[PDB]
Design an enzyme around this catalytic site. Structure first.
Site, mmCIF file in Angstrom:
data_model
loop_
_atom_site.group_PDB
_atom_site.id
_atom_site.type_symbol
_atom_site.label_atom_id
_atom_site.label_comp_id
_atom_site.label_asym_id
_atom_site.label_seq_id
_atom_site.Cartn_x
_atom_site.Cartn_y
_atom_site.Cartn_z
ATOM 1 N N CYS A 145 -18.812 1.868 -22.871
ATOM 2 C CA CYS A 145 -18.456 1.780 -24.283
ATOM 3 C C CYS A 145 -17.143 2.497 -24.536
ATOM 4 O O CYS A 145 -17.062 3.717 -24.444
ATOM 5 C CB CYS A 145 -19.592 2.390 -25.111
ATOM 6 S SG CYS A 145 -19.215 2.772 -26.857
ATOM 7 N N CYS A 196 -16.975 5.127 -27.285
ATOM 8 C CA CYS A 196 -17.747 6.307 -26.853
ATOM 9 C C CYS A 196 -16.919 7.192 -25.945
ATOM 10 O O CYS A 196 -16.971 8.420 -26.057
ATOM 11 C CB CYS A 196 -19.032 5.891 -26.117
ATOM 12 S SG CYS A 196 -20.135 4.774 -27.067
#
Length: 105
Positions: free
Chosen positions: A30, A33
Protein backbone atom coordinates in the site's frame (compact mmCIF):
# COMPACT_ATOMS: atom_id res chain seq x y z
CA UNK A 1 8.87 2.05 19.62
CA UNK A 2 6.03 1.02 17.34
CA UNK A 3 4.38 -2.25 18.44
CA UNK A 4 3.53 -5.03 15.97
CA UNK A 5 -0.09 -6.07 16.60
CA UNK A 6 -1.93 -9.34 16.13
CA UNK A 7 -4.65 -11.49 17.70
CA UNK A 8 -2.45 -12.17 20.73
CA UNK A 9 -1.76 -8.62 21.89
CA UNK A 10 -4.35 -6.38 20.17
CA UNK A 11 -6.71 -6.06 23.15
CA UNK A 12 -3.78 -5.67 25.59
CA UNK A 13 -2.36 -2.75 23.59
CA UNK A 14 -5.67 -0.89 22.99
CA UNK A 15 -6.77 -1.13 26.64
CA UNK A 16 -3.58 0.38 28.11
CA UNK A 17 -4.63 2.59 31.00
CA UNK A 18 -4.21 6.36 30.56
CA UNK A 19 -2.59 6.07 27.12
CA UNK A 20 -3.78 7.33 23.79
CA UNK A 21 -3.39 4.34 21.47
CA UNK A 22 -3.05 4.85 17.70
CA UNK A 23 -3.45 1.76 15.49
CA UNK A 24 -2.17 1.96 11.88
CA UNK A 25 -3.99 -0.43 9.53
CA UNK A 26 -1.53 -1.08 6.75
CA UNK A 27 -0.12 -3.51 4.18
CA UNK A 28 3.25 -3.93 2.46
CA UNK A 29 1.87 -3.14 -1.02
CA UNK A 30 0.00 0.00 0.00
CA UNK A 31 1.80 3.09 -1.26
CA UNK A 32 0.05 5.64 0.92
CA UNK A 33 0.69 3.40 3.95
CA UNK A 34 4.43 3.41 3.14
CA UNK A 35 4.35 7.20 2.94
CA UNK A 36 3.08 7.60 6.52
CA UNK A 37 5.21 4.84 8.09
CA UNK A 38 8.17 7.16 8.84
CA UNK A 39 5.85 9.88 10.18
CA UNK A 40 4.44 7.36 12.62
CA UNK A 41 7.98 6.29 13.70
CA UNK A 42 8.93 9.93 14.36
CA UNK A 43 5.81 10.67 16.41
CA UNK A 44 6.27 7.39 18.34
CA UNK A 45 9.59 8.80 19.54
CA UNK A 46 8.26 12.31 20.28
CA UNK A 47 5.37 10.94 22.32
CA UNK A 48 7.02 7.84 23.85
CA UNK A 49 5.42 7.17 27.21
CA UNK A 50 2.26 9.15 26.44
CA UNK A 51 1.06 7.60 23.24
CA UNK A 52 1.34 4.01 22.03
CA UNK A 53 1.57 3.34 18.27
CA UNK A 54 0.60 -0.11 17.00
CA UNK A 55 0.77 -1.54 13.50
CA UNK A 56 -1.98 -3.88 12.27
CA UNK A 57 -1.19 -5.57 8.97
CA UNK A 58 -4.53 -6.19 7.31
CA UNK A 59 -3.25 -9.07 5.14
CA UNK A 60 -2.09 -10.94 8.25
CA UNK A 61 -4.99 -9.96 10.52
CA UNK A 62 -8.08 -9.47 8.27
CA UNK A 63 -10.50 -10.46 11.08
CA UNK A 64 -9.29 -7.48 13.12
CA UNK A 65 -9.72 -5.03 10.23
CA UNK A 66 -13.21 -6.49 9.67
CA UNK A 67 -14.12 -6.15 13.34
CA UNK A 68 -13.34 -2.43 13.32
CA UNK A 69 -15.05 -1.88 9.96
CA UNK A 70 -11.87 -0.68 8.22
CA UNK A 71 -13.22 -0.02 4.71
CA UNK A 72 -10.05 1.56 3.34
CA UNK A 73 -6.33 1.73 4.12
CA UNK A 74 -4.40 3.67 5.25
CA UNK A 75 -6.64 4.23 8.33
CA UNK A 76 -5.38 5.22 11.78
CA UNK A 77 -7.80 4.48 14.65
CA UNK A 78 -7.43 6.28 17.95
CA UNK A 79 -8.35 4.56 21.21
CA UNK A 80 -8.70 5.80 24.74
CA UNK A 81 -9.42 3.31 27.49
CA UNK A 82 -10.16 0.52 25.05
CA UNK A 83 -12.68 2.46 22.93
CA UNK A 84 -12.43 4.15 19.52
CA UNK A 85 -12.44 7.92 19.91
CA UNK A 86 -11.31 9.10 16.47
CA UNK A 87 -9.89 8.08 13.12
CA UNK A 88 -7.85 9.53 10.31
CA UNK A 89 -8.56 8.02 6.89
CA UNK A 90 -5.98 8.48 4.09
CA UNK A 91 -2.30 9.57 3.79
CA UNK A 92 -2.02 12.76 5.89
CA UNK A 93 1.00 14.87 6.88
CA UNK A 94 2.63 14.77 10.30
CA UNK A 95 0.73 17.85 11.57
CA UNK A 96 -2.65 16.23 10.99
CA UNK A 97 -1.73 13.12 13.02
CA UNK A 98 -0.04 15.25 15.70
CA UNK A 99 -3.10 17.43 16.25
CA UNK A 100 -5.42 14.43 16.44
CA UNK A 101 -3.14 12.89 19.14
CA UNK A 102 -3.09 16.14 21.15
CA UNK A 103 -6.86 16.26 21.11
CA UNK A 104 -6.83 13.16 23.38
CA UNK A 105 -3.92 13.88 25.72
Amino acid sequence: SVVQLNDENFDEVIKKNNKVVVVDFWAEWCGPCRMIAPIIEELAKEYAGKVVFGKLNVDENPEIAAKYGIMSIPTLLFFKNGKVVDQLVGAMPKEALKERIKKYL
